[PDB]
């Protein structure tokens, strides 16, 4: 299933052309709303008094056909950035005229070209149009992957094409887009219609478009090869690019005339059929608030999603399995009973993970199920009366305030978040450390948070839209979000941030942290935020991880976390991004603060936890 559209510049009749395009398999049609050659005059007489009609009537199509099938196109003679003043005045009035007519038809999208460096006045006329009412209109900026000047034939005798590499020069078309959307102030109604050429540029040029809001990819017929059978195909490099564009679920647009018509379309459908992700699809780039299981009581179905992770609990069972053997040798398996304390049992999957761990280890254990959420205790006590029995002792209390009847050999907990400690696991286990034996084992025994600088103009615009009515207008940038990162670009390998160990035998326990990380960036990009992952050591070599390079294969739990920054930061190739992270806490709240110090400085985000705190 490929959403595909047909681009045309010649439509003698809308009814016949739309039917022919639809019968070839396309889902929509890109056509001009005025005749492409019908140049119009707005200022000078007598051409300004040209009698109408100026274009086709809106009655030639149903309202639903305009809403879902037609994509308008700016007339190619409209140049709002001309150096001639008269041509500017006419192009300005004409651009508004065609834009307003596209809105009058209720078109789903509208195409505008970016085929030169200076599009300042083109951006202003579009910005005034967008700020004329809050209407559900989308605008696709047609920008080529390679500038037309950079792919012309070397057939001009007195002006030979460049034969030396210009690293930033080969990225000029991304600069056209980056300037344009900055002038339009990161409008959500402005996207990219990337146009693919016959000769792809270097890898770093395609990588520039990572994290950009690409809604369409334009494929000219003239870039397709020809097999022995005579059908259009693509080179392996183009196939590699189509596969990357499929992961963004872009709409592919076929332009140009037939040189070999549904053959180009069937080749795209052919590549689409030939190619965790099943569970993460749908939440892609969906910002969520990080769970605070300590301050809040999780709902029933929130626990249900946690328990639908067999890889996560089999590691816990295995970790408890190995720890039982290492503590009770073979000759006391009938006289040595280990005291396990599930600190934060929830609905009790770790209690069952302990039962299955003691069975396959053939050791006797005594269980305490400590949970503070009284609603989950209802699940535990019905579980304990019906199945578990007297072997498990349910304790409805906070693990920091509980007065244990005895001390434990092993304490088990899953108090970790996407950023390891962002659910206050260190504070809860410290307060629970007093009833642990001197040789006691904590599962997990340690965990570490990771950070990586990302580039994603899409996610930056999404965080930017989270402004609320009765709070700081920039508070949405000073708080982390749990999001399945998708359309983004990781600029540097993740590095460890904060590390905690349990039990913390140190006499001067202090969970406040300050870390400086320097990321080598080998590309030109725009920094928008930092991706957060974590790793944890349950016991010895039994670990859990959401860090991409060492990610636990097959684990659905924990999406990455996102620390944004208020203003985007330009980063050149070879520059080092330096970020500073603080873990702050008082007697009531824990919070994070972060700041960028290289290549330029940002503000210190969330100072004193003014925008985001974690409840103790």
């Amino acid at each position: 299933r490929v959403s595909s559209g047909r681009d045309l510049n010649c439509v003698p009749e809308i009814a016949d052309t739309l039917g022919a395009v639809a019968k070839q398999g396309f889902d929509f049609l890109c056509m001009p709303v005025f005749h492409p050659r019908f140049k119009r005059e707005f200022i000078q007489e007598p051409a300004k008094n040209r009698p109408g009609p100026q274009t086709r009537s809106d009655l030639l199509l149903s309202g639903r056909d305009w809403n879902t099938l037609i994509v308008g196109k700016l007339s190619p003679w409209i140049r709002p950035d001309s150096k001639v003043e008269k041509i500017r005045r006419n192009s300005e009035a004409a651009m508004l005229q065609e834009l307003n007519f596209g809105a009058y038809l209720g078109l789903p999208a509208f195409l505008l070209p970016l085929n030169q460096e200076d599009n300042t006045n083109l951006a202003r006329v579009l910005t005034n149009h967008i700020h004329t009412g809050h209407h559900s209109s989308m605008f696709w900026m047609r920008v080529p992957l390679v500038a037309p000047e950079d792919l012309r034939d070397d057939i001009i005798e007195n002006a030979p094409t460049t034969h030396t590499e210009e690293y930033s020069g080969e990225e000029k078309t991304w600069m056209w887009w980056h300037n344009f959307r900055t002038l339009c102030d990161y409008s959500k109604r402005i996207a990219v219609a990337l146009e693919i050429g016959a000769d792809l540029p270097s890898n770093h040029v395609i990588d520039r478009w990572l994290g950009e809001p690409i809604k369409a990819a334009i494929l000219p017929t003239s870039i397709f090869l020809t097999n022995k059978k005579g059908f259009p195909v693509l080179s392996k490099m183009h196939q590699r690019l189509i596969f990357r564009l499929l992961k963004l679920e872009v709409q592919f647009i076929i332009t140009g005339t037939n040189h070999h018509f549904c053959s180009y379309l069937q080749y795209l459908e052919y590549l689409s059929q030939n190619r965790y992700e099943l569970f993460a699809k749908g939440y892609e780039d969906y910002l969520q608030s990080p769970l605070q299981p300590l301050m809040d009581n999780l709902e029933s179905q929130t626990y249900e999603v946690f328990e639908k992770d067999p890889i996560k609990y089999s590691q816990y069972q295995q970790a408890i399995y190995k720890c039982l053997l290492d503590r009770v040798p073979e000759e006391e398996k009938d006289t040595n009973v280990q005291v396990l304390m599930v600190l934060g049992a929830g609905r009790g999957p770790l209690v069952n993970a302990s039962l299955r761990a003691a069975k396959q280890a053939d050791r006797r254990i005594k269980l305490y199920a400590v949970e503070k959420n009284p609603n989950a205790v209802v699940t535990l006590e019905n579980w304990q009366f019906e199945e578990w029995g007297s072997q498990v002792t349910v304790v409805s209390s906070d693990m920091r305030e509980w007065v244990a009847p005895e001390k434990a050999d092993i304490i088990v907990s899953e108090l970790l978040g996407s950023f390891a400690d962002n659910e206050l696991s260190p504070e809860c286990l410290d307060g629970a450390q007093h009833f642990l034996k001197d040789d006691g084992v904590s599962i997990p025994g340690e965990y570490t948070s990771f950070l990586a600088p990302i580039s994603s103009s899409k996610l930056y615009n999404e965080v930017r839209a989270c402004r609320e009515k009765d709070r700081d207008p920039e508070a949405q940038f000073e708080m982390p979000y749990v999001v399945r990162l998708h359309n983004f670009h990781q600029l540097s390998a993740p590095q460890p941030c904060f590390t905690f160990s349990h039990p913390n035998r140190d006499p001067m326990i202090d969970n406040n942290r300050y870390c400086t990380l320097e990321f080598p960036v080998e590309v030109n990009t725009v920094l928008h935020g930092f991706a957060g992952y974590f790793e944890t050591v349950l016991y010895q070599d039994i670990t859990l991880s959401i860090r991409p390079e060492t990610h636990s294969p097959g684990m659905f739990s924990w999406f990455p976390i996102l620390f944004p920054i208020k203003q985007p930061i330009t980063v050149r190739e070879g520059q080092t991004i330096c970020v500073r992270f603080w873990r702050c806490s008082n007697s009531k709240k824990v919070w994070y603060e972060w700041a960028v110090t290289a290549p330029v400085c940002s503000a210190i985000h969330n100072p004193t936890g003014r925008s985001y705190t974690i409840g103790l």
């Binding site: 439509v11 003698p12 005749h35 050659r37 140049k39 051409a47 086709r56 000047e149 005798e157 017929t221």
Partner: protein, 292 residues
């Protein structure tokens, strides 16, 4: 007939060829001979006519019975008159360009022609084999005009919205040569001098270039430039200011016509009376001018 008249070309005996297209309304197409030039643009008193699939962006005669058409459909069409010159039949229709074919011009041999299109491409055609001999991508914007050399079969001009004026010579390994402002819009060779041509820009300036004299002739974009068939040629310039101007050897204004009420798209001199000049425009007017 369609409202917007695009091209007007006299042939040898004096018959007038008209190329029109409907640039508004329900149907966007065009049409294509008047053995009585004063009877134009009336449809009831014509010699022949035919309807193409799409609009006519530019055309030119091919000998005495051939009509080479640049279509909005991206195809180059060559229409031919029958032996009775009562019908206009299509010879071939090759969709080779990816965008609107905006300009077309026949080379000196009469068996080859060059086409420019908004796909930034320029192609050389062999009217005999109905194939494209060469395809050049020398510009970086829409090709606005191409004009074959009047007496050199491998030489032609071209200008595009990249502010480039290229002199071509397909006999060289690099056939294009850039000629040294505002965007050029119309190209016209000198009929009696080899290395001399004129061009007009989008700012209403006609200039004289040798392998430089310029004069501000119009207030809008210069659409076309046509020389007179005299021994010492006059220069007819039509523009989007809806005016017609006739210039001399030093680009000075000798005649000025504001008869048209819309864009003036083409102009053709009469082969029988060298003083008569016929212009067409988007106002559906065919005006016959008597140049003093």
């Amino acid at each position: 007939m369609e409202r917007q008249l695009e091209a007007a070309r006299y042939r040898s005996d004096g018959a007038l060829l008209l190329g029109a297209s409907s640039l508004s309304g329900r149907c966007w197409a065009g049409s294509l001979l008047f053995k009585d030039p004063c009877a134009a643009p009336n449809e009831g008193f014509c010699s022949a006519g035919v309807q193409t699939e799409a609009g006519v962006a530019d055309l030119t005669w091919v000998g005495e019975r051939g009509i080479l058409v640049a279509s909005d459909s991206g195809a180059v069409e060559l229409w031919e008159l029958d032996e009775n010159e009562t019908l206009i039949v299509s010879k071939f229709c090759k969709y080779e360009h990816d965008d609107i074919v905006s300009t077309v011009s026949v080379l000196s041999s009469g068996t080859q022609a060059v086409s420019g299109s908004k796909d930034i491409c320029i192609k050389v055609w062999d009217l005999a084999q109905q194939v494209v001999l060469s395809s050049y991508r020398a510009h970086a914007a829409q090709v606005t005009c191409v004009a074959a050399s009047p007496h050199k079969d491998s030489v032609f001009l071209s200008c595009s919205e990249d502010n480039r004026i290229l002199l071509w010579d397909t006999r060289c390994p690099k056939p294009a040569s850039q000629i040294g402002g505002y965007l050029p819009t119309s190209l016209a060779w000198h009929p009696q001098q080899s290395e001399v041509f004129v061009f007009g820009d989008e700012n209403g300036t006609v200039s004289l270039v040798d392998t430089v004299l310029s004069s501000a002739v119009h207030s809008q974009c210069v659409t076309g430039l046509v020389f007179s068939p005299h021994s010492v040629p006059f220069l007819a310039s039509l523009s989007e200011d809806c005016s017609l101007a006739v210039l001399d050897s030093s680009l000075s204004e000798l005649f000025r016509s504001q008869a048209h009420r819309d864009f003036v798209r083409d102009a053709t001199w009469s082969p029988l009376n060298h003083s008569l000049l016929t212009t067409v425009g988007w106002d559906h007017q065919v005006v016959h001018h008597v140049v003093p």
